[PDB]
């Protein structure tokens, strides 16, 4: 439950000039799990 930053970063580049919202937020909330 800590691979978030990894895929959330692969999204990072997926959109260089993007603006709105991402999953790293819900991802970090769900993957933070422990």
Report on this model:
The chain is mainly alpha-helical and 34 residues long. It has one domain. It has two helices and no strands. The longest helix has 11 residues. It starts with a helix and ends with a helix. Pulmonary surfactant-associated proteins promote alveolar stability by lowering the surface tension at the air-liquid interface in the peripheral air spaces. SP-B increases the collapse pressure of palmitic acid to nearly 70 millinewtons per meter.
Notable traits:
mainly alpha, 2 helices, surface active protein, 34 residues, 0% strand
SSE topology sketch:
Blueprint: H1 4-14, H2 24-31
Helix pairs in contact: 1-2
PDB class: surface active protein
Keywords: Mini-B, SP-B, Surfactant Protein B, Lipid associated protein, surface active protein
Assembly: monomeric
H-E order: HH
User: Biggest sheet, open or closed, and with what strands and sense?
Assistant: none
Strand content: under 5%
Q: Give the number of helices.
A: 2
Could you tell me the number of beta strands?
A: 0
Shape descriptor: elongated
**Helical fraction:** 55-70%
C-alpha end-to-end distance: 7 Å
Number of domains as seen in the coordinates? 1
| Structural class by SSE content | mainly alpha
Taking all Cα atoms into account, the compactness measure Rg is 10 Å
Function: Pulmonary surfactant-associated proteins promote alveolar stability by lowering the surface tension at the air-liquid interface in the peripheral air spaces. SP-B increases the collapse pressure of palmitic acid to nearly 70 millinewtons per meter.
Subcellular location: Secreted, Extracellular space, Surface film
Protein name: Pulmonary surfactant-associated protein B
Organism: Homo sapiens
């Amino acid at each position: 439950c800590w691979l978030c930053r990894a895929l959330i970063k692969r999204i990072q580049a997926m959109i260089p000039k993007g603006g709105r919202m991402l999953p790293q937020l819900v991802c970090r909330l769900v993957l933070r799990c422990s």
